[PDB]
Amino acid sequence: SQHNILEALNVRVVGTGDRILFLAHGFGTDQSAWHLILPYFTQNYRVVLYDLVCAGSVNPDYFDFNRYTTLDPYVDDLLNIVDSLGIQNCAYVGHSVSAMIGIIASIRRPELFSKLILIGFSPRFLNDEDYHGGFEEGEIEKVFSAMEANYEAWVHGFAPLAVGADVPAAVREFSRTLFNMRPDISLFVSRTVFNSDLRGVLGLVRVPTCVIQTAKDVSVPASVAEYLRSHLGGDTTVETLKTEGHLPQLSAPAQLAQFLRRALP
Ligand SMILES: CC(=O)/C=C/C=C(C)\C=C\C1=C(C)C[C@H](O)CC1(C)C
């Protein structure tokens, strides 16, 4: 139930250091997205990885549509893993939805995180009055229709856009993990995430935070970076990668590793 979570979400611990580094993947991927970055840190860090319940590498029977209606159960899962491993202090790297999860988690448990590293992070995707998130409700409904009508065609068109840079290996990988997801789960999670809004709680963040924005993220306008600088409550830094795309850990691992290396405690 809540009790076999380590096996259910493929929790793996690698590396040698005392300092615990948590690598948390985002939408459409699983923990294998970190495999190019991982060798940069395993000599100096104790690295914890897991898969979100919605990952295609997780048994889809674990995805309870009745439960996973907001981000809060996802946060519960993260903290359950943390507590189950007996982790009292760690550095946390969250990509995409895992960035959103980490924000909430750090408000709940400020003492747990020495540092938040947020990659491809947005507090809100939908545009509001005086807020450019990058999407509109009508647009999103058409995406959901395409996903339902022919998920695989959608993935085929989407994966290259999301990877952004001309790195076929990265596109192929992101496609693979998207195709592994059960289509109805992908759609449901997308609905959940698109209708989330963390703008109200950004000021409550107390933990030191590094935001790593990419050059041209389909999910995150450049304006969001400055917004986060203005609104995040903790000691915050914002930095921009020179490479384009939503998935730097696959498309530009050397550059991402460099940024991480100097941001990490
Ligand atoms: C079709 C199109 O161009 C618009 C993208 C539509 C998808 C479904 C967006 C998916 C996601 C991206 C990849 C990264 C975000 O962090 C989380 C979120 C669920 C919003």
Short mmCIF file of C-alpha atoms and ligand atoms in Angstrom, two decimals:
data_model
loop_
_atom_site.label_atom_id
_atom_site.label_comp_id
_atom_site.label_asym_id
_atom_site.label_seq_id
_atom_site.Cartn_x
_atom_site.Cartn_y
_atom_site.Cartn_z
CA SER A 1 0.00 0.00 0.00
CA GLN A 2 2.06 2.89 1.40
CA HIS A 3 4.40 0.22 2.78
CA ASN A 4 6.23 -1.34 -0.20
CA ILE A 5 7.11 2.00 -1.75
CA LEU A 6 10.86 1.36 -2.09
CA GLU A 7 10.25 -1.56 -4.48
CA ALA A 8 7.10 -0.09 -6.04
CA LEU A 9 8.86 3.12 -7.12
CA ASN A 10 12.20 1.49 -7.99
CA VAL A 11 14.20 3.30 -5.31
CA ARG A 12 17.95 2.92 -5.90
CA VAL A 13 20.91 4.24 -3.91
CA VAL A 14 24.31 4.60 -5.60
CA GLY A 15 27.67 6.27 -4.94
CA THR A 16 29.92 6.63 -1.90
CA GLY A 17 29.80 10.02 -0.15
CA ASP A 18 28.14 10.88 3.16
CA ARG A 19 26.20 13.76 1.54
CA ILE A 20 22.86 12.54 0.20
CA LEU A 21 21.92 13.74 -3.30
CA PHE A 22 18.33 13.17 -4.40
CA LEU A 23 17.68 13.06 -8.16
CA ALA A 24 13.98 13.33 -9.01
CA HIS A 25 12.79 13.07 -12.61
CA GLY A 26 9.91 14.88 -14.32
CA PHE A 27 6.97 14.24 -16.65
CA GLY A 28 7.48 11.71 -19.45
CA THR A 29 10.76 10.31 -18.10
CA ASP A 30 11.95 7.98 -15.37
CA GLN A 31 15.16 7.89 -13.30
CA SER A 32 17.14 6.61 -16.31
CA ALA A 33 17.08 10.24 -17.50
CA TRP A 34 19.84 10.87 -14.93
CA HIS A 35 22.20 8.19 -16.25
CA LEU A 36 24.49 10.56 -18.18
CA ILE A 37 24.84 12.94 -15.20
CA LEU A 38 25.20 10.24 -12.54
CA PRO A 39 28.95 9.45 -13.03
CA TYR A 40 29.74 13.10 -12.26
CA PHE A 41 28.46 12.73 -8.69
CA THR A 42 28.75 9.12 -7.51
CA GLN A 43 32.34 9.52 -6.28
CA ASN A 44 31.45 12.41 -3.94
CA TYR A 45 27.73 11.89 -3.27
CA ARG A 46 25.36 9.20 -2.03
CA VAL A 47 22.76 9.38 -4.79
CA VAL A 48 19.11 8.39 -4.28
CA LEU A 49 16.89 7.91 -7.33
CA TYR A 50 13.27 6.86 -7.68
CA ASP A 51 10.50 6.79 -10.27
CA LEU A 52 7.31 8.82 -9.89
CA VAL A 53 4.17 6.66 -9.59
CA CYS A 54 3.24 7.83 -13.11
CA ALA A 55 6.48 6.58 -14.71
CA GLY A 56 6.13 3.84 -17.32
CA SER A 57 8.81 1.92 -15.44
CA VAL A 58 6.34 1.62 -12.53
CA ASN A 59 3.55 -0.96 -12.48
CA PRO A 60 0.53 1.07 -13.73
CA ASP A 61 -1.71 -0.67 -11.17
CA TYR A 62 -0.05 1.57 -8.56
CA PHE A 63 -1.50 4.65 -10.25
CA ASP A 64 -4.73 5.26 -8.34
CA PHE A 65 -6.82 7.76 -10.33
CA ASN A 66 -8.87 8.36 -7.16
CA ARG A 67 -5.78 9.39 -5.19
CA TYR A 68 -3.43 11.25 -7.55
CA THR A 69 -5.71 14.24 -8.22
CA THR A 70 -3.28 16.95 -7.06
CA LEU A 71 0.46 17.23 -6.36
CA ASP A 72 0.01 16.49 -2.64
CA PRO A 73 -0.01 12.64 -2.89
CA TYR A 74 3.15 12.90 -5.02
CA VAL A 75 4.77 14.87 -2.18
CA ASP A 76 3.55 12.20 0.26
CA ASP A 77 5.34 9.58 -1.86
CA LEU A 78 8.60 11.57 -1.90
CA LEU A 79 8.55 12.11 1.86
CA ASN A 80 7.53 8.48 2.44
CA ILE A 81 10.63 7.40 0.49
CA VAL A 82 12.82 9.84 2.44
CA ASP A 83 11.53 8.63 5.81
CA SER A 84 11.64 4.97 4.71
CA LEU A 85 15.35 5.38 3.90
CA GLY A 86 15.95 7.25 7.18
CA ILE A 87 17.21 10.34 5.35
CA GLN A 88 17.31 13.36 7.69
CA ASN A 89 19.28 15.70 5.40
CA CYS A 90 19.83 15.84 1.63
CA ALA A 91 20.35 18.03 -1.42
CA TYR A 92 17.42 17.68 -3.82
CA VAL A 93 17.45 18.04 -7.61
CA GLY A 94 13.93 18.25 -9.05
CA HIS A 95 13.13 18.37 -12.76
CA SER A 96 9.76 19.52 -14.10
CA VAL A 97 7.00 18.05 -11.91
CA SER A 98 9.61 16.94 -9.35
CA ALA A 99 10.62 20.60 -9.01
CA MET A 100 7.02 21.42 -8.06
CA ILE A 101 6.99 18.45 -5.67
CA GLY A 102 10.24 19.57 -4.03
CA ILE A 103 8.91 23.10 -3.41
CA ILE A 104 5.89 21.75 -1.52
CA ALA A 105 8.03 19.18 0.31
CA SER A 106 10.49 21.86 1.47
CA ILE A 107 7.65 23.98 2.91
CA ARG A 108 6.35 20.93 4.81
CA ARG A 109 9.84 19.81 5.90
CA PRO A 110 12.29 22.78 5.77
CA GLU A 111 14.93 20.95 7.82
CA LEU A 112 15.17 18.07 5.33
CA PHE A 113 16.73 20.05 2.46
CA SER A 114 20.15 21.70 2.56
CA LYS A 115 19.47 22.93 -0.98
CA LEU A 116 16.81 22.80 -3.70
CA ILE A 117 18.02 22.55 -7.29
CA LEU A 118 15.09 23.17 -9.64
CA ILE A 119 15.34 22.42 -13.37
CA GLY A 120 12.66 23.34 -15.92
CA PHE A 121 10.49 24.60 -13.06
CA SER A 122 7.25 26.56 -13.43
CA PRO A 123 4.81 27.51 -10.62
CA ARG A 124 1.98 27.74 -13.18
CA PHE A 125 1.68 26.81 -16.86
CA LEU A 126 -1.63 28.53 -17.64
CA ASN A 127 -1.47 32.27 -18.35
CA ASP A 128 -3.25 34.52 -15.81
CA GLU A 129 -3.82 38.30 -15.70
CA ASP A 130 -0.25 39.77 -15.48
CA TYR A 131 1.20 36.22 -15.52
CA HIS A 132 2.73 34.56 -18.56
CA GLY A 133 2.86 30.80 -17.96
CA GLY A 134 2.96 29.93 -21.67
CA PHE A 135 -0.37 28.12 -22.14
CA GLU A 136 -4.13 28.71 -22.43
CA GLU A 137 -7.09 26.53 -21.44
CA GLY A 138 -8.29 26.00 -25.02
CA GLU A 139 -4.80 25.01 -26.17
CA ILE A 140 -4.51 22.53 -23.31
CA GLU A 141 -7.87 20.92 -24.13
CA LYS A 142 -6.72 20.25 -27.70
CA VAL A 143 -3.51 18.66 -26.38
CA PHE A 144 -5.64 16.41 -24.17
CA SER A 145 -7.82 15.50 -27.18
CA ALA A 146 -4.76 14.62 -29.27
CA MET A 147 -3.32 12.57 -26.40
CA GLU A 148 -6.60 10.65 -26.11
CA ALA A 149 -7.22 10.22 -29.85
CA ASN A 150 -3.71 9.00 -30.71
CA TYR A 151 -1.18 9.16 -27.87
CA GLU A 152 1.63 7.68 -29.95
CA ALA A 153 1.27 10.21 -32.77
CA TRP A 154 1.28 12.94 -30.11
CA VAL A 155 4.51 11.59 -28.56
CA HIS A 156 6.11 11.35 -32.01
CA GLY A 157 5.45 15.05 -32.67
CA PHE A 158 6.09 16.20 -29.10
CA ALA A 159 9.35 14.49 -28.08
CA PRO A 160 11.56 16.44 -30.58
CA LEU A 161 9.97 19.77 -29.58
CA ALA A 162 10.53 19.07 -25.88
CA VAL A 163 14.15 17.97 -26.36
CA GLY A 164 14.51 21.06 -28.54
CA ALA A 165 18.15 20.64 -29.59
CA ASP A 166 19.10 18.38 -32.51
CA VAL A 167 20.28 15.45 -30.39
CA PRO A 168 18.59 12.31 -31.87
CA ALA A 169 19.83 10.11 -29.01
CA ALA A 170 18.05 12.39 -26.51
CA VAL A 171 14.83 12.45 -28.57
CA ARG A 172 14.83 8.65 -28.89
CA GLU A 173 15.27 8.25 -25.11
CA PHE A 174 12.50 10.70 -24.18
CA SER A 175 10.20 9.06 -26.73
CA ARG A 176 10.94 5.64 -25.19
CA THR A 177 9.92 6.70 -21.67
CA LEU A 178 6.81 8.52 -22.93
CA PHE A 179 5.75 5.41 -24.88
CA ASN A 180 6.28 3.33 -21.72
CA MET A 181 3.63 5.39 -19.91
CA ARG A 182 0.06 4.10 -20.13
CA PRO A 183 -1.70 6.76 -22.29
CA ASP A 184 -4.53 7.46 -19.82
CA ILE A 185 -1.96 8.02 -17.06
CA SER A 186 0.04 10.48 -19.18
CA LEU A 187 -3.16 12.42 -19.92
CA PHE A 188 -4.36 12.37 -16.31
CA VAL A 189 -1.00 13.53 -14.93
CA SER A 190 -0.85 16.28 -17.57
CA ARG A 191 -4.31 17.46 -16.50
CA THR A 192 -3.17 17.44 -12.86
CA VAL A 193 0.00 19.42 -13.56
CA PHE A 194 -1.53 21.95 -15.98
CA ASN A 195 -4.16 22.87 -13.37
CA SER A 196 -1.65 23.31 -10.53
CA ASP A 197 -0.58 26.69 -9.17
CA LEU A 198 2.24 27.19 -6.64
CA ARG A 199 2.47 30.99 -7.02
CA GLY A 200 0.67 31.38 -3.67
CA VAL A 201 3.25 29.38 -1.68
CA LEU A 202 6.57 30.48 -3.25
CA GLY A 203 7.03 33.10 -0.51
CA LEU A 204 6.88 30.36 2.16
CA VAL A 205 10.03 28.66 0.82
CA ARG A 206 12.87 29.04 3.34
CA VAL A 207 15.47 26.60 1.99
CA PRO A 208 18.33 27.85 -0.26
CA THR A 209 17.28 27.41 -3.90
CA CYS A 210 19.01 27.26 -7.27
CA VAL A 211 16.70 27.58 -10.27
CA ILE A 212 18.20 26.27 -13.51
CA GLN A 213 16.18 27.59 -16.47
CA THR A 214 16.90 26.34 -20.00
CA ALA A 215 17.28 28.59 -23.05
CA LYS A 216 14.07 27.58 -24.84
CA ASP A 217 11.75 25.34 -22.82
CA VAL A 218 8.39 24.56 -24.46
CA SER A 219 6.92 24.26 -20.95
CA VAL A 220 8.61 27.28 -19.33
CA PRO A 221 8.83 30.85 -20.73
CA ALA A 222 12.01 32.82 -20.01
CA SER A 223 9.93 35.32 -18.00
CA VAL A 224 9.25 32.65 -15.34
CA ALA A 225 12.90 32.81 -14.22
CA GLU A 226 12.64 36.47 -13.17
CA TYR A 227 9.24 35.80 -11.60
CA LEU A 228 10.78 33.10 -9.40
CA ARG A 229 13.64 35.43 -8.41
CA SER A 230 11.05 37.97 -7.24
CA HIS A 231 8.74 35.55 -5.45
CA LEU A 232 10.79 32.72 -3.90
CA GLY A 233 11.14 33.26 -0.14
CA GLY A 234 14.48 31.52 0.44
CA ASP A 235 17.99 32.62 -0.50
CA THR A 236 17.48 32.07 -4.22
CA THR A 237 19.69 32.01 -7.31
CA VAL A 238 18.49 31.83 -10.92
CA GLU A 239 20.76 30.61 -13.72
CA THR A 240 20.18 29.94 -17.42
CA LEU A 241 21.73 27.12 -19.44
CA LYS A 242 23.01 28.05 -22.90
CA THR A 243 21.67 24.83 -24.44
CA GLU A 244 18.01 24.74 -25.52
CA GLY A 245 15.41 22.13 -24.55
CA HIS A 246 13.39 20.79 -21.61
CA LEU A 247 15.72 17.84 -20.94
CA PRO A 248 19.32 19.11 -20.41
CA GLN A 249 20.23 15.92 -18.51
CA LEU A 250 19.80 14.00 -21.79
CA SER A 251 20.73 16.61 -24.42
CA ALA A 252 23.51 18.57 -22.66
CA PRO A 253 24.69 16.43 -19.68
CA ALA A 254 28.17 17.97 -19.49
CA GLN A 255 26.79 21.51 -19.17
CA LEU A 256 24.10 20.54 -16.66
CA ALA A 257 26.66 18.60 -14.59
CA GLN A 258 28.84 21.72 -14.49
CA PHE A 259 25.97 23.87 -13.19
CA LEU A 260 25.03 21.23 -10.61
CA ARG A 261 28.64 20.78 -9.51
CA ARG A 262 28.93 24.42 -8.42
CA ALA A 263 25.37 24.70 -7.04
CA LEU A 264 25.48 21.60 -4.83
CA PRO A 265 26.60 21.70 -1.16
C1 LIG B 1 1.69 19.74 -27.29
C2 LIG B 1 2.44 20.94 -26.69
O1 LIG B 1 3.18 21.57 -27.36
C3 LIG B 1 2.24 21.32 -25.23
C4 LIG B 1 2.87 20.35 -24.24
C5 LIG B 1 1.86 19.42 -23.58
C6 LIG B 1 2.47 18.45 -22.57
C7 LIG B 1 1.48 17.37 -22.12
C8 LIG B 1 3.21 19.13 -21.42
C9 LIG B 1 3.73 18.13 -20.39
C10 LIG B 1 4.64 18.70 -19.29
C11 LIG B 1 5.96 19.20 -19.69
C12 LIG B 1 6.65 18.29 -20.71
C13 LIG B 1 6.95 19.54 -18.61
C14 LIG B 1 6.28 20.19 -17.39
O2 LIG B 1 7.19 20.29 -16.36
C15 LIG B 1 5.05 19.34 -16.93
C16 LIG B 1 3.96 19.13 -18.03
C17 LIG B 1 2.96 18.08 -17.56
C18 LIG B 1 3.23 20.46 -18.26
#
